[PDB]
């Protein structure tokens, strides 16, 4: 509980500080990679793989809400690395709402399958 209390403040601190075709191919390659993960090591390989794919996706206010609601379902090291990934995304918001909802909805059903 205390460590969780130490992840949320750090997120809040971060938030306060902040205050074509070739891309569609990189979205599809990211899905094939997310699909190999689908049905500490067993979290660590999906969690390492999550980084090169979110970088490829999003190199190519509302997105922090969508990822924050995604994080509240994940919360409700294996949580702590998704929280550090969330903190980086509070400083670097990038993407488009419809696609970011589809990618995070595939996060919700991948988390409901690790469930």
């Amino acid at each position: 509980r205390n460590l969780l209390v130490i992840a949320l403040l750090f997120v809040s601190f971060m938030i306060w500080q902040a205050w074509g075709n070739w891309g569609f191919s990189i979205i599809i390659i990211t899905f094939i990679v997310r699909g190999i993960m689908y049905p500490p090591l067993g979290g660590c390989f999906p969690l390492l793989i999550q980084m090169p794919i979110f970088l490829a996706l999003y190199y190519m206010y509302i997105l922090p809400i969508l990822m924050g609601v995604t994080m509240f379902f994940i919360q409700k090291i294996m949580t702590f690395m998704p929280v550090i990934f969330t903190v980086f995304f509070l400083w670097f918001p990038s993407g488009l709402v419809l696609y970011y909802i589809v990618s995070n909805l595939v996060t919700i059903i991948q988390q409901q399958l690790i469930y």
Binding site: P40, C44, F45, P52, L55, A56, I77
Partner: peptide, 23 residues
């Protein structure tokens, strides 16, 4: 610098997690 922000960021995050988790 695109590649260095790309595979700099993730490939090290990879490196430590293989190390942490898989250790």
């Amino acid at each position: 610098m695109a590649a260095a922000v790309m595979m700099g960021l993730a490939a090290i995050g990879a490196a430590i997690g293989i190390g942490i988790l898989g250790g």
